[PDB]
Design a binder for these strands. Structure first.
Ligand SMILES: [Mg+2]
Ligand SMILES: [Mg+2]
Length: 174
DNA sequence: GCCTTGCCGGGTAA
DNA sequence: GTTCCGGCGCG
DNA sequence: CGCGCCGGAACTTAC
DNA sequence: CCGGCAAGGC
């Protein structure tokens, strides 16, 4: 159970939130696992109980916080343990098994994919990350390309070929 | 001649 | 998305 | 005194 | 993220 939900959550974190090691007025600190999202409902209904499931399984004692901001809501767990659990998992991403790869790619697409489904695309500034995913998708028989989509901000796009539309949607999304 | 997809500019949602 | 701010508890 | 959870949100920009 | 434009192939 745990590996799949972890990879999915990491997907969301990487793309719509982040992992933060903080240093405050002497000499305090904080370790944060964050996912931000426009919809408070999606955070409470879908994301938070998955995070809560993981927290319980890992015996993390921190609580899930939901903080209102100007433009989005923030799901935040303040936990050194959870922070390293995800940061280490991120470093070892190349060792993911198929269940984890599929969950992670799914997270990526929910967070930052072409949601219109007329085109199948994933955006990110991290080319290296997209190239891992690109390799995974090839082994799943999903052809794709990576190109610099935005010369302003250095944002690359991973475009999934519509020739493999069906296989992508059914393997990754459904 | 239709589809796919590279390219790019605006602008919310991170 | 990121890192500032203000709290608090703990050894 | 040094570190780590809590709650907020101004500030900045990648999708 | 979105979505219009258009250039490149069956
Ligand atoms: Mg992102
Ligand atoms: Mg998003």
């Amino acid at each position: 159970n745990v590996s799949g939900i972890s990879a999915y959550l990491l997907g969301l974190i990487i793309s719509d939130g982040g992992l933060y090691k903080l240093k405050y007025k002497g000499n305090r600190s904080e370790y944060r696992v964050v996912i931000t999202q426009k919809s408070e409902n999606l955070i409470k209904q879908h994301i938070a109980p998955l995070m809560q499931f993981l927290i319980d399984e890992l015996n993390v004692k921190s609580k899930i916080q939901i903080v209102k901001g100007d433009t989005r809501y923030e799901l935040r767990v303040s936990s050194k343990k959870l922070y390293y659990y995800f940061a280490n998992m991120l470093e070892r991403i190349r060792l993911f098994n198929m269940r984890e790869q599929i969950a992670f790619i799914k997270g990526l697409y929910v967070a930052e994919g072409d949601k219109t489904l007329k085109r199948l695309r994933i955006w990110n500034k991290n080319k290296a990350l997209l190239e891992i995913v690109s390799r995974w998708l090839n082994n799943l028989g999903v052809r794709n390309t990576i190109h610099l989509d935005d010369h302003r901000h250095g944002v690359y796009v991973l475009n999934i070929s519509l020739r493999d539309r069906i296989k992508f949607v059914h393997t990754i999304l459904s």
